[PDB]
mmCIF file of C-alpha atoms in Angstrom:
data_model
loop_
_atom_site.group_PDB
_atom_site.id
_atom_site.type_symbol
_atom_site.label_atom_id
_atom_site.label_comp_id
_atom_site.label_asym_id
_atom_site.label_seq_id
_atom_site.Cartn_x
_atom_site.Cartn_y
_atom_site.Cartn_z
ATOM 1 C CA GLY A 1 99.529 120.800 103.369
ATOM 2 C CA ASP A 2 100.729 118.382 106.054
ATOM 3 C CA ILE A 3 103.348 115.915 104.856
ATOM 4 C CA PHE A 4 103.146 112.413 106.231
ATOM 5 C CA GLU A 5 104.398 108.941 105.367
ATOM 6 C CA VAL A 6 102.423 105.692 105.125
ATOM 7 C CA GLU A 7 103.616 102.093 104.884
ATOM 8 C CA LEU A 8 101.445 99.685 102.877
ATOM 9 C CA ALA A 9 102.113 95.940 102.454
ATOM 10 C CA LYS A 10 101.037 94.966 98.920
ATOM 11 C CA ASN A 11 98.646 92.052 98.471
ATOM 12 C CA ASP A 12 97.382 90.772 95.103
ATOM 13 C CA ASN A 13 99.788 93.210 93.470
ATOM 14 C CA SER A 14 97.746 96.051 94.870
ATOM 15 C CA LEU A 15 97.964 99.057 97.155
ATOM 16 C CA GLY A 16 94.166 99.236 97.125
ATOM 17 C CA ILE A 17 94.051 102.831 95.831
ATOM 18 C CA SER A 18 93.604 104.494 92.458
ATOM 19 C CA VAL A 19 95.453 107.567 91.187
ATOM 20 C CA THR A 20 94.936 110.466 88.791
ATOM 21 C CA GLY A 21 97.099 113.263 87.461
ATOM 22 C CA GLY A 22 100.463 113.930 85.864
ATOM 23 C CA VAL A 23 102.308 116.929 84.458
ATOM 24 C CA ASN A 24 100.495 116.574 81.102
ATOM 25 C CA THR A 25 96.969 116.030 82.486
ATOM 26 C CA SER A 26 94.320 118.569 83.468
ATOM 27 C CA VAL A 27 94.142 117.370 87.081
ATOM 28 C CA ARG A 28 94.989 120.159 89.563
ATOM 29 C CA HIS A 29 98.500 121.473 88.758
ATOM 30 C CA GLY A 30 100.113 118.270 87.481
ATOM 31 C CA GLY A 31 100.618 116.242 90.644
ATOM 32 C CA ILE A 32 99.642 112.646 91.394
ATOM 33 C CA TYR A 33 96.528 112.288 93.553
ATOM 34 C CA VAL A 34 94.774 109.501 95.407
ATOM 35 C CA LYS A 35 91.329 109.243 93.804
ATOM 36 C CA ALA A 36 89.856 106.273 95.681
ATOM 37 C CA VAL A 37 90.750 103.990 98.574
ATOM 38 C CA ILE A 38 89.090 100.570 98.518
ATOM 39 C CA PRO A 39 88.752 98.623 101.789
ATOM 40 C CA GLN A 40 91.937 96.677 101.020
ATOM 41 C CA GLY A 41 93.834 99.968 100.828
ATOM 42 C CA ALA A 42 92.313 101.223 104.075
ATOM 43 C CA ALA A 43 93.424 97.976 105.715
ATOM 44 C CA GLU A 44 96.982 98.102 104.326
ATOM 45 C CA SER A 45 97.391 101.698 105.577
ATOM 46 C CA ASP A 46 95.466 101.338 108.878
ATOM 47 C CA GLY A 47 93.144 104.097 107.709
ATOM 48 C CA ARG A 48 95.873 106.652 107.048
ATOM 49 C CA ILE A 49 95.643 107.094 103.238
ATOM 50 C CA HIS A 50 92.770 109.186 101.933
ATOM 51 C CA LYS A 51 91.143 110.318 98.709
ATOM 52 C CA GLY A 52 92.657 113.649 97.736
ATOM 53 C CA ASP A 53 96.103 112.936 99.195
ATOM 54 C CA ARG A 54 98.899 113.922 96.821
ATOM 55 C CA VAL A 55 101.535 111.200 96.323
ATOM 56 C CA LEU A 56 104.980 112.827 96.517
ATOM 57 C CA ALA A 57 107.213 109.762 96.515
ATOM 58 C CA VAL A 58 107.223 105.977 96.285
ATOM 59 C CA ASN A 59 110.062 104.415 98.311
ATOM 60 C CA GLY A 60 113.214 106.155 97.143
ATOM 61 C CA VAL A 61 111.634 107.570 93.953
ATOM 62 C CA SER A 62 110.390 111.158 93.944
ATOM 63 C CA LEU A 63 107.299 111.658 91.776
ATOM 64 C CA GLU A 64 108.139 115.328 91.109
ATOM 65 C CA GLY A 65 107.566 116.009 87.422
ATOM 66 C CA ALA A 66 106.077 112.556 86.725
ATOM 67 C CA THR A 67 103.695 111.894 83.875
ATOM 68 C CA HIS A 68 100.662 109.717 84.627
ATOM 69 C CA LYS A 69 102.321 106.676 83.045
ATOM 70 C CA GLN A 70 105.538 107.269 85.001
ATOM 71 C CA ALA A 71 103.650 107.511 88.308
ATOM 72 C CA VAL A 72 101.608 104.366 87.565
ATOM 73 C CA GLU A 73 104.730 102.457 86.496
ATOM 74 C CA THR A 74 106.541 103.554 89.672
ATOM 75 C CA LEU A 75 103.595 102.604 91.868
ATOM 76 C CA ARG A 76 103.204 99.201 90.160
ATOM 77 C CA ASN A 77 106.878 98.169 90.039
ATOM 78 C CA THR A 78 107.438 97.622 93.718
ATOM 79 C CA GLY A 79 106.321 95.080 96.281
ATOM 80 C CA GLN A 80 106.317 93.877 99.904
ATOM 81 C CA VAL A 81 106.186 96.939 102.194
ATOM 82 C CA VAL A 82 105.770 100.099 100.107
ATOM 83 C CA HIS A 83 106.585 103.531 101.518
ATOM 84 C CA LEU A 84 104.571 106.502 100.287
ATOM 85 C CA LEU A 85 105.213 110.125 101.158
ATOM 86 C CA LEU A 86 101.898 111.996 101.058
ATOM 87 C CA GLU A 87 100.512 115.511 101.394
ATOM 88 C CA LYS A 88 97.019 116.013 102.847
ATOM 89 C CA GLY A 89 94.456 117.291 100.354
ATOM 90 C CA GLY B 1 87.152 117.860 81.250
ATOM 91 C CA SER B 2 88.490 114.301 80.924
ATOM 92 C CA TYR B 3 90.878 112.373 83.168
ATOM 93 C CA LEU B 4 92.225 108.852 83.632
ATOM 94 C CA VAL B 5 91.865 106.836 86.854
ATOM 95 C CA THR B 6 94.324 103.969 87.395
ATOM 96 C CA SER B 7 94.069 101.386 90.158
ATOM 97 C CA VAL B 8 97.417 100.343 91.632
#
């Protein structure tokens, strides 16, 4: 329920997380969700991103209504310091 | 049932 923002500096083209979901998937009610955080992702976020967080936005792009491919493309096509708006699982 | 996981 809590909304919070994280800032993650991409290395090796990676946020160090994996995501599931999309309006046309069976995951929850169509949102984008953090499925795993690998130690690189924990480091980039100073421990603040967690499995089960819903990803609401990437920088200026809202993920409302995104398909899985749209969310992945949005997450991939950015660099340097990435801003994520999240909702606690 | 079935879902896709994508590392980013």
